[PDB]
């Protein structure tokens, strides 16, 4: 998961 | 011979660790409780967000007897941190902090808090690990792990070394078992460096201003739709490198202010505050 | 080089803490002595006086004391005290007895490294280490105005009545119980209590002398006085009903002061003479 | 001043403590555990309960390397197992001081991979020595400690403040009967015994113990008996000299099968402990 | 709550 | 149990  | 002791750390740091009570409207009753750390003479105090969430009134109590109505200056859900402020003249006990000290694995540490509202209590352990993701599957966050015993009520309190220097803000213990056993000695604290950085941010912007691009996941692509802030100068699915004069990365994107034009290669985007 | 170690404390004090067994005669149907409960004890002097917890020895038909050197004795109960949960045993030894190191001038400090000596779950004597977490603690839940030392040195069933010593093997307190009790669901970790050595000792000498701790009961319940339920008799000497008070026996306004005055002595109370009775 | 720390012991020993994965047929992780790299050849000690019924065992060092490992041997009695990996660029090994004798009260560090959170270090002291462990009637020599030990620590290292191996953390007192939860009670196999077991495993693939014909000083069983007790010995009675040696439990197992041994109150051949 |  |  990634939240940029 | 004198008894081996960490009383020096206690004398130096305990006075600044306070008891925090989150009182809500049923009249006014205690919803939760925890601890907090007096960071400076101005009256600022760090603690956990979850400890003050949905509070109608936050009370802070010091070991010297004084009690105060506290102001919520800000909070951040990602790091579960929160800053409070007490209007105290006469002088406030403050927490020793050494910005140059590098915490090491194995360092002796003391947890200072108010477990089960029993009154302030100091427990002892060591730094078990660094840069961890706690319970959360995977979040842009890294805690200190310690075997110093922490219980309900320790949340938001101080984790200090044998010199009384703040190492971190205790948060939670490891939750459940794999097969009926209760985990023992696994606790987490936010590194005092990140806590100090988030405090100042909360004090300046009333909250944490993070720069969010417009994609979810080296490589970019999602199992779910992407955000509208991705149509500024990048492609659908691929990898990236130099972004705003720097070779490829997470934390840097958030440290950039919303609205700014950032040059993205594989050519310019505008950062939009994390929704 | 030299490994960091607290063995010196262990070597000095462990020999003096004993395993205590509470056996009963009506525990099984053939009425053969059988363990009902077990815990630890601390040999205080060479006369054979031993301190333990009252709850460890309540209603016992036979109290057995086993030392680390292999000797086993039958112990006599000389007295106990509900308020502090202390009991004093006495064995009849010849050949000498190991005794716990006591430094009456030492003042325990929050943060002092401490070692708990006992017999958890009857595995045999075990040493656990922590620090003094707090002092002057109510420990329990009600009042039990009996200052407790709090510590995170691991304490389990079997440690009760045992020793809590600092790194010099000096007696800091008598371990009494673990905050194992979380009124609902959770399991506290590292919250244990111990009666301070100075209190333990005063209680012991009183138990050896009178066979019970004689306290002073004025005659009221509930700074200020006031009971949600009926007052006692001895309050019909020279006092009002629901009010404060300052000087009681020439001294500023106290709880544990009343109890310390022998029953029968006429005392001057302000806001003047009252007779103290033994706490009922 | 300088902060009190056991970081030295951590730097010296932690690098040799590895994460063990017991995968089982696709291949899926059946259990986690720890292991200690004993020497440069690549021999690793861990708990047998950790690698049991493993279709494939994987070892991961803290430096990033990951290897498939060979199960050279295991022992039920001691719950020990020895693994082998074939590194080439050198391996980190656990400090071992064979002349050092552990004392009750020595400060210790438990090094392992609790709940797969990653390598963690916990500190306590040696609470006791010569303990039969979690269950009587089948005694052993265990080291007891209050250094927090959780699921995942098994097969890992217990070291003193110098980083010297004191023992191999095995199981922990999880719950006394059906009542409450014990706190600060953990066990480890003494390093001296783990070393003696490892060597036997490396040499034979298992521990070859010398068995004769008795069970349950006096001699008499509270349940039946066996065959091998028919080479030249009585029924139920104590003994003294066994193989030119006055009275003995660990010596009979220390003798290898095939050999003939003289007894008194006059010869029997050593069978292997079934 | 007191006990005098 | 003496498993000699």
mmCIF file of N, CA and C in Angstrom, chain B residues 123-234:
data_model
loop_
_atom_site.group_PDB
_atom_site.id
_atom_site.type_symbol
_atom_site.label_atom_id
_atom_site.label_comp_id
_atom_site.label_asym_id
_atom_site.label_seq_id
_atom_site.Cartn_x
_atom_site.Cartn_y
_atom_site.Cartn_z
ATOM 1 N N UNK B 123 8.369 2.422 34.926
ATOM 2 C CA UNK B 123 8.723 1.029 34.663
ATOM 3 C C UNK B 123 10.038 1.065 33.863
ATOM 4 N N UNK B 124 10.805 -0.027 33.903
ATOM 5 C CA UNK B 124 12.118 -0.092 33.239
ATOM 6 C C UNK B 124 12.292 -1.229 32.232
ATOM 7 N N UNK B 125 12.975 -0.919 31.134
ATOM 8 C CA UNK B 125 13.235 -1.888 30.084
ATOM 9 C C UNK B 125 14.379 -1.342 29.239
ATOM 10 N N UNK B 126 14.425 -1.723 27.968
ATOM 11 C CA UNK B 126 15.459 -1.257 27.059
ATOM 12 C C UNK B 126 14.832 -0.957 25.696
ATOM 13 N N UNK B 127 15.591 -0.317 24.812
ATOM 14 C CA UNK B 127 15.083 -0.073 23.476
ATOM 15 C C UNK B 127 15.234 -1.426 22.784
ATOM 16 N N UNK B 128 14.111 -2.055 22.466
ATOM 17 C CA UNK B 128 14.095 -3.352 21.816
ATOM 18 C C UNK B 128 14.306 -3.305 20.313
ATOM 19 N N UNK B 129 13.915 -2.209 19.680
ATOM 20 C CA UNK B 129 14.049 -2.116 18.233
ATOM 21 C C UNK B 129 13.727 -0.707 17.789
ATOM 22 N N UNK B 130 14.094 -0.384 16.549
ATOM 23 C CA UNK B 130 13.856 0.949 15.990
ATOM 24 C C UNK B 130 13.254 0.901 14.582
ATOM 25 N N UNK B 131 12.603 1.998 14.194
ATOM 26 C CA UNK B 131 11.974 2.082 12.886
ATOM 27 C C UNK B 131 11.013 0.940 12.620
ATOM 28 N N UNK B 132 9.994 0.810 13.465
ATOM 29 C CA UNK B 132 9.010 -0.256 13.310
ATOM 30 C C UNK B 132 7.649 0.270 12.868
ATOM 31 N N UNK B 133 6.791 -0.630 12.395
ATOM 32 C CA UNK B 133 5.464 -0.241 11.932
ATOM 33 C C UNK B 133 4.343 -0.604 12.921
ATOM 34 N N UNK B 134 4.721 -0.913 14.160
ATOM 35 C CA UNK B 134 3.741 -1.257 15.178
ATOM 36 C C UNK B 134 2.778 -2.363 14.786
ATOM 37 N N UNK B 135 1.496 -2.159 15.081
ATOM 38 C CA UNK B 135 0.463 -3.141 14.755
ATOM 39 C C UNK B 135 -0.002 -2.943 13.310
ATOM 40 N N UNK B 136 -0.206 -1.680 12.940
ATOM 41 C CA UNK B 136 -0.652 -1.309 11.602
ATOM 42 C C UNK B 136 0.073 -2.118 10.527
ATOM 43 N N UNK B 137 -0.688 -2.716 9.593
ATOM 44 C CA UNK B 137 -0.110 -3.521 8.511
ATOM 45 C C UNK B 137 1.097 -2.846 7.861
ATOM 46 N N UNK B 138 0.889 -1.626 7.371
ATOM 47 C CA UNK B 138 1.952 -0.859 6.733
ATOM 48 C C UNK B 138 1.560 0.606 6.572
ATOM 49 N N UNK B 139 2.153 1.458 7.400
ATOM 50 C CA UNK B 139 1.868 2.878 7.334
ATOM 51 C C UNK B 139 3.167 3.654 7.334
ATOM 52 N N UNK B 140 3.154 4.843 6.742
ATOM 53 C CA UNK B 140 4.350 5.673 6.692
ATOM 54 C C UNK B 140 4.632 6.182 8.104
ATOM 55 N N UNK B 141 5.074 5.271 8.968
ATOM 56 C CA UNK B 141 5.365 5.597 10.360
ATOM 57 C C UNK B 141 6.318 4.553 10.958
ATOM 58 N N UNK B 142 7.208 4.992 11.846
ATOM 59 C CA UNK B 142 8.166 4.083 12.468
ATOM 60 C C UNK B 142 8.350 4.364 13.967
ATOM 61 N N UNK B 143 8.010 3.377 14.795
ATOM 62 C CA UNK B 143 8.117 3.520 16.246
ATOM 63 C C UNK B 143 9.395 2.926 16.827
ATOM 64 N N UNK B 144 9.553 3.119 18.134
ATOM 65 C CA UNK B 144 10.644 2.529 18.898
ATOM 66 C C UNK B 144 9.870 1.405 19.588
ATOM 67 N N UNK B 145 10.476 0.231 19.735
ATOM 68 C CA UNK B 145 9.821 -0.874 20.435
ATOM 69 C C UNK B 145 10.543 -1.019 21.782
ATOM 70 N N UNK B 146 9.809 -1.267 22.857
ATOM 71 C CA UNK B 146 10.454 -1.402 24.151
ATOM 72 C C UNK B 146 9.767 -2.428 25.021
ATOM 73 N N UNK B 147 10.514 -3.006 25.954
ATOM 74 C CA UNK B 147 9.930 -3.987 26.849
ATOM 75 C C UNK B 147 9.641 -3.358 28.195
ATOM 76 N N UNK B 148 9.839 -2.049 28.302
ATOM 77 C CA UNK B 148 9.477 -1.342 29.532
ATOM 78 C C UNK B 148 7.949 -1.534 29.559
ATOM 79 N N UNK B 149 7.405 -1.947 30.689
ATOM 80 C CA UNK B 149 5.972 -2.204 30.784
ATOM 81 C C UNK B 149 5.045 -1.008 30.679
ATOM 82 N N UNK B 150 4.158 -1.030 29.690
ATOM 83 C CA UNK B 150 3.188 0.046 29.545
ATOM 84 C C UNK B 150 1.780 -0.559 29.550
ATOM 85 N N UNK B 151 0.854 0.157 30.160
ATOM 86 C CA UNK B 151 -0.517 -0.302 30.272
ATOM 87 C C UNK B 151 -1.462 0.826 29.902
ATOM 88 N N UNK B 152 -2.761 0.531 29.887
ATOM 89 C CA UNK B 152 -3.740 1.557 29.587
ATOM 90 C C UNK B 152 -3.445 2.667 30.583
ATOM 91 N N UNK B 153 -3.280 3.886 30.082
ATOM 92 C CA UNK B 153 -2.963 4.991 30.971
ATOM 93 C C UNK B 153 -1.555 5.525 30.723
ATOM 94 N N UNK B 154 -0.707 4.728 30.069
ATOM 95 C CA UNK B 154 0.665 5.142 29.752
ATOM 96 C C UNK B 154 0.679 5.965 28.470
ATOM 97 N N UNK B 155 -0.359 5.788 27.655
ATOM 98 C CA UNK B 155 -0.473 6.473 26.367
ATOM 99 C C UNK B 155 -0.268 7.986 26.398
ATOM 100 N N UNK B 156 0.698 8.438 25.602
ATOM 101 C CA UNK B 156 1.024 9.847 25.531
ATOM 102 C C UNK B 156 2.128 10.237 26.499
ATOM 103 N N UNK B 157 2.542 9.296 27.343
ATOM 104 C CA UNK B 157 3.596 9.555 28.314
ATOM 105 C C UNK B 157 5.016 9.484 27.762
ATOM 106 N N UNK B 158 5.992 9.736 28.630
ATOM 107 C CA UNK B 158 7.396 9.764 28.226
ATOM 108 C C UNK B 158 8.199 8.468 28.348
ATOM 109 N N UNK B 159 9.096 8.263 27.389
ATOM 110 C CA UNK B 159 10.017 7.123 27.380
ATOM 111 C C UNK B 159 11.377 7.827 27.435
ATOM 112 N N UNK B 160 12.068 7.730 28.574
ATOM 113 C CA UNK B 160 13.366 8.397 28.738
ATOM 114 C C UNK B 160 14.525 7.429 28.974
ATOM 115 N N UNK B 161 15.751 7.866 28.681
ATOM 116 C CA UNK B 161 16.919 7.015 28.914
ATOM 117 C C UNK B 161 17.428 7.245 30.327
ATOM 118 N N UNK B 162 18.510 6.564 30.703
ATOM 119 C CA UNK B 162 19.043 6.679 32.062
ATOM 120 C C UNK B 162 19.467 8.075 32.452
ATOM 121 N N UNK B 163 19.513 8.993 31.489
ATOM 122 C CA UNK B 163 19.887 10.381 31.775
ATOM 123 C C UNK B 163 18.645 11.268 31.855
ATOM 124 N N UNK B 164 17.486 10.680 31.571
ATOM 125 C CA UNK B 164 16.252 11.434 31.621
ATOM 126 C C UNK B 164 15.927 12.133 30.311
ATOM 127 N N UNK B 165 16.681 11.832 29.256
ATOM 128 C CA UNK B 165 16.466 12.455 27.955
ATOM 129 C C UNK B 165 15.333 11.794 27.205
ATOM 130 N N UNK B 166 14.334 12.572 26.819
ATOM 131 C CA UNK B 166 13.206 12.014 26.094
ATOM 132 C C UNK B 166 13.625 11.191 24.882
ATOM 133 N N UNK B 167 13.219 9.924 24.856
ATOM 134 C CA UNK B 167 13.522 9.030 23.736
ATOM 135 C C UNK B 167 12.288 8.898 22.845
ATOM 136 N N UNK B 168 11.111 9.017 23.464
ATOM 137 C CA UNK B 168 9.870 8.894 22.715
ATOM 138 C C UNK B 168 8.601 9.098 23.527
ATOM 139 N N UNK B 169 7.470 9.045 22.838
ATOM 140 C CA UNK B 169 6.167 9.218 23.471
ATOM 141 C C UNK B 169 5.509 7.862 23.370
ATOM 142 N N UNK B 170 5.264 7.219 24.506
ATOM 143 C CA UNK B 170 4.654 5.885 24.497
ATOM 144 C C UNK B 170 3.255 5.913 23.902
ATOM 145 N N UNK B 171 2.964 4.924 23.079
ATOM 146 C CA UNK B 171 1.672 4.852 22.443
ATOM 147 C C UNK B 171 0.920 3.591 22.842
ATOM 148 N N UNK B 172 1.105 2.492 22.128
ATOM 149 C CA UNK B 172 0.394 1.283 22.519
ATOM 150 C C UNK B 172 1.260 0.030 22.631
ATOM 151 N N UNK B 173 0.699 -1.005 23.249
ATOM 152 C CA UNK B 173 1.388 -2.282 23.405
ATOM 153 C C UNK B 173 0.909 -3.182 22.274
ATOM 154 N N UNK B 174 1.604 -4.287 22.042
ATOM 155 C CA UNK B 174 1.201 -5.217 20.996
ATOM 156 C C UNK B 174 -0.097 -5.898 21.461
ATOM 157 N N UNK B 175 -1.113 -5.871 20.599
ATOM 158 C CA UNK B 175 -2.452 -6.395 20.896
ATOM 159 C C UNK B 175 -2.744 -7.873 21.177
ATOM 160 N N UNK B 176 -3.096 -8.619 20.133
ATOM 161 C CA UNK B 176 -3.466 -10.019 20.307
ATOM 162 C C UNK B 176 -2.480 -11.127 19.965
ATOM 163 N N UNK B 177 -2.880 -12.324 20.386
ATOM 164 C CA UNK B 177 -2.120 -13.546 20.219
ATOM 165 C C UNK B 177 -2.396 -14.310 18.949
ATOM 166 N N UNK B 178 -1.484 -15.229 18.671
ATOM 167 C CA UNK B 178 -1.557 -16.089 17.511
ATOM 168 C C UNK B 178 -2.318 -17.349 17.909
ATOM 169 N N UNK B 179 -2.384 -17.620 19.212
ATOM 170 C CA UNK B 179 -3.085 -18.806 19.692
ATOM 171 C C UNK B 179 -3.344 -18.842 21.203
ATOM 172 N N UNK B 180 -4.035 -17.828 21.710
ATOM 173 C CA UNK B 180 -4.368 -17.793 23.123
ATOM 174 C C UNK B 180 -3.346 -17.292 24.127
ATOM 175 N N UNK B 181 -2.167 -16.874 23.676
ATOM 176 C CA UNK B 181 -1.147 -16.381 24.606
ATOM 177 C C UNK B 181 -1.153 -14.854 24.638
ATOM 178 N N UNK B 182 -0.881 -14.261 25.790
ATOM 179 C CA UNK B 182 -0.852 -12.807 25.835
ATOM 180 C C UNK B 182 0.591 -12.313 25.621
ATOM 181 N N UNK B 183 0.807 -11.478 24.594
ATOM 182 C CA UNK B 183 2.163 -10.983 24.357
ATOM 183 C C UNK B 183 2.645 -10.208 25.576
ATOM 184 N N UNK B 184 3.926 -10.338 25.888
ATOM 185 C CA UNK B 184 4.502 -9.674 27.042
ATOM 186 C C UNK B 184 5.700 -8.831 26.625
ATOM 187 N N UNK B 185 5.800 -7.628 27.181
ATOM 188 C CA UNK B 185 6.930 -6.761 26.893
ATOM 189 C C UNK B 185 7.121 -6.200 25.493
ATOM 190 N N UNK B 186 6.042 -6.029 24.747
ATOM 191 C CA UNK B 186 6.175 -5.453 23.423
ATOM 192 C C UNK B 186 5.337 -4.165 23.380
ATOM 193 N N UNK B 187 6.021 -3.031 23.494
ATOM 194 C CA UNK B 187 5.361 -1.740 23.468
ATOM 195 C C UNK B 187 5.968 -0.834 22.410
ATOM 196 N N UNK B 188 5.264 0.245 22.086
ATOM 197 C CA UNK B 188 5.757 1.148 21.065
ATOM 198 C C UNK B 188 5.701 2.595 21.477
ATOM 199 N N UNK B 189 6.625 3.376 20.944
ATOM 200 C CA UNK B 189 6.645 4.787 21.252
ATOM 201 C C UNK B 189 7.041 5.520 19.981
ATOM 202 N N UNK B 190 6.596 6.756 19.838
ATOM 203 C CA UNK B 190 6.956 7.502 18.653
ATOM 204 C C UNK B 190 8.318 8.100 18.942
ATOM 205 N N UNK B 191 9.261 7.974 18.002
ATOM 206 C CA UNK B 191 10.587 8.544 18.246
ATOM 207 C C UNK B 191 10.443 10.022 18.561
ATOM 208 N N UNK B 192 11.115 10.470 19.614
ATOM 209 C CA UNK B 192 11.051 11.864 20.034
ATOM 210 C C UNK B 192 11.391 12.852 18.910
ATOM 211 N N UNK B 193 12.090 12.385 17.883
ATOM 212 C CA UNK B 193 12.456 13.261 16.780
ATOM 213 C C UNK B 193 11.226 13.583 15.945
ATOM 214 N N UNK B 194 10.453 12.549 15.626
ATOM 215 C CA UNK B 194 9.247 12.707 14.831
ATOM 216 C C UNK B 194 8.201 13.442 15.673
ATOM 217 N N UNK B 195 8.154 13.161 16.971
ATOM 218 C CA UNK B 195 7.186 13.818 17.839
ATOM 219 C C UNK B 195 7.446 15.315 17.925
ATOM 220 N N UNK B 196 8.717 15.701 17.969
ATOM 221 C CA UNK B 196 9.101 17.109 18.055
ATOM 222 C C UNK B 196 8.795 17.831 16.730
ATOM 223 N N UNK B 197 9.022 17.123 15.634
ATOM 224 C CA UNK B 197 8.755 17.639 14.307
ATOM 225 C C UNK B 197 7.235 17.843 14.135
ATOM 226 N N UNK B 198 6.424 16.855 14.530
ATOM 227 C CA UNK B 198 4.973 16.975 14.411
ATOM 228 C C UNK B 198 4.420 18.035 15.366
ATOM 229 N N UNK B 199 4.999 18.147 16.554
ATOM 230 C CA UNK B 199 4.522 19.158 17.481
ATOM 231 C C UNK B 199 4.626 20.526 16.799
ATOM 232 N N UNK B 200 5.850 20.940 16.460
ATOM 233 C CA UNK B 200 6.072 22.232 15.807
ATOM 234 C C UNK B 200 5.123 22.470 14.633
ATOM 235 N N UNK B 201 4.833 21.429 13.853
ATOM 236 C CA UNK B 201 3.916 21.561 12.722
ATOM 237 C C UNK B 201 2.516 21.865 13.226
ATOM 238 N N UNK B 202 2.103 21.145 14.258
ATOM 239 C CA UNK B 202 0.788 21.337 14.833
ATOM 240 C C UNK B 202 0.684 22.703 15.461
ATOM 241 N N UNK B 203 1.785 23.199 16.010
ATOM 242 C CA UNK B 203 1.746 24.510 16.642
ATOM 243 C C UNK B 203 1.681 25.628 15.605
ATOM 244 N N UNK B 204 2.317 25.417 14.458
ATOM 245 C CA UNK B 204 2.337 26.431 13.414
ATOM 246 C C UNK B 204 1.092 26.494 12.522
ATOM 247 N N UNK B 205 0.647 25.354 12.005
ATOM 248 C CA UNK B 205 -0.507 25.322 11.110
ATOM 249 C C UNK B 205 -1.793 24.845 11.753
ATOM 250 N N UNK B 206 -1.810 24.730 13.074
ATOM 251 C CA UNK B 206 -3.010 24.246 13.730
ATOM 252 C C UNK B 206 -3.210 22.774 13.406
ATOM 253 N N UNK B 207 -2.347 22.241 12.543
ATOM 254 C CA UNK B 207 -2.390 20.834 12.162
ATOM 255 C C UNK B 207 -1.246 20.495 11.212
ATOM 256 N N UNK B 208 -1.223 19.259 10.729
ATOM 257 C CA UNK B 208 -0.156 18.829 9.839
ATOM 258 C C UNK B 208 -0.484 18.979 8.355
ATOM 259 N N UNK B 209 0.237 19.883 7.696
ATOM 260 C CA UNK B 209 0.074 20.148 6.269
ATOM 261 C C UNK B 209 0.971 19.194 5.479
ATOM 262 N N UNK B 210 0.394 18.122 4.942
ATOM 263 C CA UNK B 210 1.166 17.157 4.157
ATOM 264 C C UNK B 210 0.875 17.294 2.661
ATOM 265 N N UNK B 211 1.910 17.121 1.842
ATOM 266 C CA UNK B 211 1.747 17.230 0.402
ATOM 267 C C UNK B 211 1.467 15.907 -0.295
ATOM 268 N N UNK B 212 0.209 15.700 -0.673
ATOM 269 C CA UNK B 212 -0.221 14.477 -1.349
ATOM 270 C C UNK B 212 -0.304 14.666 -2.866
ATOM 271 N N UNK B 213 0.346 13.782 -3.620
ATOM 272 C CA UNK B 213 0.315 13.864 -5.080
ATOM 273 C C UNK B 213 -1.060 13.429 -5.588
ATOM 274 N N UNK B 214 -1.146 12.234 -6.166
ATOM 275 C CA UNK B 214 -2.424 11.764 -6.671
ATOM 276 C C UNK B 214 -2.436 10.312 -7.109
ATOM 277 N N UNK B 215 -1.572 9.499 -6.511
ATOM 278 C CA UNK B 215 -1.500 8.083 -6.855
ATOM 279 C C UNK B 215 -1.281 7.204 -5.625
ATOM 280 N N UNK B 216 -1.669 5.939 -5.742
ATOM 281 C CA UNK B 216 -1.498 5.000 -4.650
ATOM 282 C C UNK B 216 -0.720 3.798 -5.149
ATOM 283 N N UNK B 217 -0.162 3.015 -4.230
ATOM 284 C CA UNK B 217 0.603 1.844 -4.628
ATOM 285 C C UNK B 217 0.303 0.609 -3.801
ATOM 286 N N UNK B 218 10.300 3.831 -7.125
ATOM 287 C CA UNK B 218 9.994 2.424 -7.354
ATOM 288 C C UNK B 218 8.979 2.269 -8.487
ATOM 289 N N UNK B 219 7.710 2.052 -8.148
ATOM 290 C CA UNK B 219 6.675 1.889 -9.167
ATOM 291 C C UNK B 219 5.339 2.498 -8.744
ATOM 292 N N UNK B 220 4.576 2.987 -9.722
ATOM 293 C CA UNK B 220 3.273 3.601 -9.464
ATOM 294 C C UNK B 220 2.134 2.889 -10.194
ATOM 295 N N UNK B 221 1.068 2.595 -9.453
ATOM 296 C CA UNK B 221 -0.122 1.917 -9.971
ATOM 297 C C UNK B 221 -0.972 1.464 -8.787
ATOM 298 N N UNK B 222 -2.287 1.403 -8.973
ATOM 299 C CA UNK B 222 -3.181 1.000 -7.889
ATOM 300 C C UNK B 222 -4.171 -0.104 -8.242
ATOM 301 N N UNK B 223 -4.650 -0.795 -7.209
ATOM 302 C CA UNK B 223 -5.633 -1.860 -7.369
ATOM 303 C C UNK B 223 -6.995 -1.176 -7.330
ATOM 304 N N UNK B 224 -6.957 0.130 -7.075
ATOM 305 C CA UNK B 224 -8.145 0.973 -7.006
ATOM 306 C C UNK B 224 -7.825 2.316 -7.676
ATOM 307 N N UNK B 225 -8.857 3.038 -8.150
ATOM 308 C CA UNK B 225 -8.703 4.335 -8.820
ATOM 309 C C UNK B 225 -7.652 5.288 -8.238
ATOM 310 N N UNK B 226 -7.126 6.165 -9.092
ATOM 311 C CA UNK B 226 -6.123 7.147 -8.689
ATOM 312 C C UNK B 226 -6.765 8.521 -8.505
ATOM 313 N N UNK B 227 -6.071 9.405 -7.794
ATOM 314 C CA UNK B 227 -6.597 10.736 -7.540
ATOM 315 C C UNK B 227 -6.496 11.724 -8.689
ATOM 316 N N UNK B 228 -7.312 12.795 -8.670
ATOM 317 C CA UNK B 228 -7.338 13.840 -9.701
ATOM 318 C C UNK B 228 -6.069 14.695 -9.758
ATOM 319 N N UNK B 229 -5.236 14.604 -8.726
ATOM 320 C CA UNK B 229 -4.003 15.385 -8.670
ATOM 321 C C UNK B 229 -2.834 14.686 -9.357
ATOM 322 N N UNK B 230 -3.146 13.781 -10.278
ATOM 323 C CA UNK B 230 -2.120 13.042 -11.004
ATOM 324 C C UNK B 230 -2.064 13.426 -12.483
ATOM 325 N N UNK B 231 -2.956 14.317 -12.906
ATOM 326 C CA UNK B 231 -2.997 14.753 -14.301
ATOM 327 C C UNK B 231 -2.270 16.081 -14.499
ATOM 328 N N UNK B 232 -1.135 16.240 -13.827
ATOM 329 C CA UNK B 232 -0.366 17.474 -13.928
ATOM 330 C C UNK B 232 0.860 17.366 -14.834
ATOM 331 N N UNK B 233 1.391 16.157 -14.995
ATOM 332 C CA UNK B 233 2.558 15.983 -15.845
ATOM 333 C C UNK B 233 3.181 14.600 -15.796
ATOM 334 N N UNK B 234 2.403 13.614 -15.357
ATOM 335 C CA UNK B 234 2.874 12.232 -15.265
ATOM 336 C C UNK B 234 1.996 11.279 -16.076
#
